[PDB]
């Protein structure tokens, strides 16, 4: 098992026991995953597979599954720590990397919000918060299930003391920015989103695409119905396979579609929008 775990790791490009090879993805995942029926309850071949980009569901719920073995194998074969790990989606706009406990818990978190096990999810993410209320990743956690959940208002909430930090970095800046912007527009709040919108340029692509379809609907909510269509014309010009872009761009009457903190607190099921009372309830 340690032998075929130590060929495994260099077949992703790193050092051990000295020796290093050029990284072969498709053979390292062939390779963990093959390693994953020998030793099933051990993390590290877990780990392994998605550090070699096999980041399923499955995957992601075995790490967690065999936590309790995590750096067990890493550990035999000399790997320092934080060498092995794997990058998981957040669900919204962010992509993190994994390489602990607390970051398998929120890889799971994400599976699990994804399933919709919303009150799951957020019980990790809280439990987490409860030992490390500052650290970022977890707090971006927690809004990403509530984005999900359609809980605008737990967004602004939540991203409205974050958006101040110091030392954000350029793609961290630019989701916040705009979680808060979009968040802002879905409650009705829409000069506030256009001071996050009015440029939603920047390095995530996604983020880029949906802070000016946002955008654009703000400005058609506040009657500026040729200025959304050039907004909208740039960007299907652009990201011409987009339907979402296309049915705003060729549909003028479309409006996002909003609502308020008072409305989402009155849901019998918190996680459930579909129990949101609209304006008329």
Known sequence: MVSRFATCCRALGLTVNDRQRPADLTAARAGFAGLTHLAHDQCDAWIGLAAAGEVTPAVVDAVWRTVASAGVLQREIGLAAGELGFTYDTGWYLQFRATEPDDFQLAYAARLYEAGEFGEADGLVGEILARRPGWFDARWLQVAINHRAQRWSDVVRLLTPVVT??????????????????????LGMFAPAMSYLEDPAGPIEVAAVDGALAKALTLRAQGEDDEATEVLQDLFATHPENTQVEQALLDTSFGLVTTTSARIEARSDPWDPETEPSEAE
Request: proline residues 5%; neutral net charge.
């Open 165 to 186: 930090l110091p030392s954000l970095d350029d793609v961290t800046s630019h989701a916040v920015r705009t979680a808060l912007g979009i968040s802002l527009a879905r």
